Symmetry: D4
Subunit: 162 residues, 8 copies
């Protein structure tokens, strides 16, 4: 597996399952793990330190509220980190988004949309990255995009059949 999907809590799985779905569709081997900067800080450090050796080329990290997980991983590895802001209850993911995207100069995290759209798109982006060097994966992405496009094109009128 060349991609790891991690998240701050098991309660984030309802969101992050949409990243894993994309990888099943595109036949991308992936790791899935609950890793919390706040509740499991030492495992976070260990996970981030061993990511390259473990063969990860992209890491997708999701968290809600004061969403530190993606940034703290990015601080401890040169493996590209993609951040998914989970939709929090009070602030509807604005807290998650700001906590993730607003990284200082030197430690980037590529941030996707709040919520399930973002989880899916994080997997698609990870796939696009891997596809630069994986021609079979490149073809499969190409095919999947064409399928999305064609479905829309085949159904131009949203109204009831008549």
């Amino acid at each position: 597996a060349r991609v790891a999907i991690v998240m701050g809590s098991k309660s984030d799985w309802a969101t992050m399952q949409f990243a894993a779905e994309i990888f099943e569709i595109l036949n991308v081997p992936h790791h899935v793990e609950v890793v919390s900067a706040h509740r499991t800080p030492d495992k976070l450090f260990s996970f981030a330190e061993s990511a390259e050796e473990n063969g990860y080329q992209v890491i997708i990290a999701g968290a809600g509220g004061a969403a530190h997980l993606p940034g703290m991983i990015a601080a401890k590895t040169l493996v590209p980190v993609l951040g998914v802001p989970v939709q929090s209850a009070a602030l509807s993911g604005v807290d998650s988004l700001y906590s993730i995207v607003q990284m200082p100069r030197g430690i980037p995290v590529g941030t996707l949309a709040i919520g399930k759209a973002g989880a899916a798109n994080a997997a698609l982006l990870a796939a696009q990255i891997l596809a630069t060097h994986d021609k079979e994966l490149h073809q499969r992405l190409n095919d999947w995009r064409k399928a999305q496009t064609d479905e829309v094109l085949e159904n131009p009128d949203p109204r009831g059949a008549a």
Copy 2:
């Protein structure tokens, strides 16, 4: 020193100097250090792990933007952590505030106002905490508050002298 003041960058000093000022006024010994979760992650872990042994009873941490520093310290010590959101340029500290205050259940950070007001108030709160067991410090806080109150009371009319 029973209090440590730390911050994510030397550029935060313009703000965090107002915390140190309060400690000079109240004669509270304190440590001051640049500690970054993002740029110096290992030192953050070491600092947090050794805080109790080093004699710290309150930690004041300030950072801007994706402000992870206070929360990451709080994840690694039981010493109370107080967070100061530094006023960021684009988002005027809303990013800092959300990144600090919105901690998940289990790892608290007591958050103060955005900016220099918050830095001062973090020192005052740290002092109030210490004062529960330090009667001389308690008296000095009491005296300082009375001085603030009396100044306002002595100057009820904001208009020009006439």
Copy 3:
């Protein structure tokens, strides 16, 4: 009891019960009372004035909307005040958060997350403060944190059993 939990309305109890829960778990004696700056202003003043004599070393105060209760207590005692922003209907606690955290220089309130996460974390922070001088309580916090960490570590994969 060395901690008081107060709130602006009985309707805040749905939130503030999560602070009291933490104290039951950690065996921390505590007081619970509805105290409103707006509806019971004189009792607020009396409560704040008598807090030290009554043996309180931390006060946790929660309120929604124009959330003045924590700050008004803090104006009238040197006992540390922790503020919990209750999640209001229209503004989802942004009004509560701003009303609490944005205190002027001289009168601090250590603010926690909007909602039930914040109520819990306020109790945990109060506990961390008390634990500086209460070794048995310190051990119990330590044990509780390890239990949270270990649960996450013991359940790394959020997916269905297979």
Copy 4:
């Protein structure tokens, strides 16, 4: 004087001077005082308790950030309170506005615009209230409004003279 203008700090005078200006224009006797819920809580209570006896029929209160002053006065008198949110630095008065307008059922504060527009309009509203029973003041307001209207009507084209 049937109106009192109060504010949380002398630094608020730059804003609240625009309320006093309106009263000078309309020849309305008024009191001006720095009264802080946070720095002078006891004077706040005394001021609010004695407002009716002192002859006040409207109170205009201004404050910035965690702006508790108007609401705390309103909690302690039946004299109508009008609130002016001062434009704070970080949050540009959104904190002031929310802290003032979002009062719970039972204790109203009539809130005006953030900043100097609001200070002026608070005085005008206070004047409109008083004018219900003061025919000479009613005429003077009427005349002042006509003067504003006529100035605009007399200058329909904003372009340079030609």
Copy 5:
């Protein structure tokens, strides 16, 4: 009737009924009418022009979204106008609040909280205004406030009976 309650739509009644409730409780005669600046502009002008002659001393106006009704009434009468921001669906009354409170210098509207709290408080404020010259109404407000206070004081503990 010395107070009129108006609103932009019949759909606002769910909110504005809480203003009328207060007047029933305090025995304040009042008028209730749907008046829209957008859908009935001419009636708005007629209503505002005839308000003084019709005996109104306070007008309470409520509207949602682009909430122009209160301000447009205030532009056309010297009778004090109080504005109630109705909680809109998308923006949860932030649009309503801004549209109402942010009036330019010369034309004030005293704004209350978003939603049903605001509707009630608008009636209470209108009552406080009228009470300056209506001693029987003043007593009734005083009694009602004491009843609210006493209820809270009589029920200090929010927990289940035991």
Copy 6:
């Protein structure tokens, strides 16, 4: 003139001059006038009522803060109204934008960007509308757009000459 540019205050001219500029460039005859819903309500009604007879086919209206002008014109004429939110000081035109765009069903206002970009674009949109039936104007818009495009295309590299 088939287009009128109006604004709530002469202070809005700094912004609305960018609409007039576009009309000078495209040789579109236009009217310019300060018309305020708040300060000149009767003239607003008269202006809106006579717009069709006066030959206006688009009206561009700009205002800041509680920006009622565009919507109140739209309530009183079937001539299409385009709204320009002026950038207010405290809220940076969010108040202006919400006050303009959030119109209820039945009375539309086509809203453009906050500030000078919006003023220009309002004139361009008005021009596009008129161009549907004015072939010479259509050509001139076409030419102006090509000029903008070509300038960008002719300068692909933003770096210093070397």
Copy 7:
């Protein structure tokens, strides 16, 4: 058909159906199509390029989140474009609104309210535009507006019958 209604997804139809409703009421022939800048970019370009030839004089475009559809159409035709921000889940259409209204100088989109109110108002505005040159349509709009006004006027009291 002189108006086209397009939208980024079939899921937007729940909103955009309220635009089509207005056209049915006013007997305005219209086209309806799902056109996505993101999922069908080439069809977007083709649609925009052929709009004038196809007889469209107004285009109404709706989309949610990162709502690029209206602006990308406007970049590729001189036919006036009206934008409808669909109410997104996390951000309640603030993302949609900003993505649509905040167009740079040169490429306007006339933006309506978030959600179903906006969809209706976009159709009404399109109709007002067309009505400048379509006297029968002008009469029908006039009649429809009078019907809305009269309904409100005929039902001034929102209370229960008695």
Copy 8:
């Protein structure tokens, strides 16, 4: 060059120069071009269509306000796109951020911080991606990060020399 830096306007260069700086530091060959979805739509399509053939493995795109450029490129190529929100005047890049990050499922853009921090971090992320397969570049990133870390570690005390 395996990376292209593009932006909506020459006025964005003040921001995007910080991306190019990182590439100069790390000796990464790169292309720089003004490409606008709004002002040069056809060139955008051509650029995106030819990106893979032209040898680009990452594209960094920056734009302000209604920031469509990154997303429209991402719609037309499988080459990973990274988005930089430029800090707009009115909304301080919140419009830019929302327009970029909130992409629907299927078309991702990895978004970085508002402003110059984001531009730098976009280049660093692009570099991290390329470094997965470029060992010399990997070493250079590693060295650069160590240099940043060491500088902070070498300067722990922000206070004046004494």
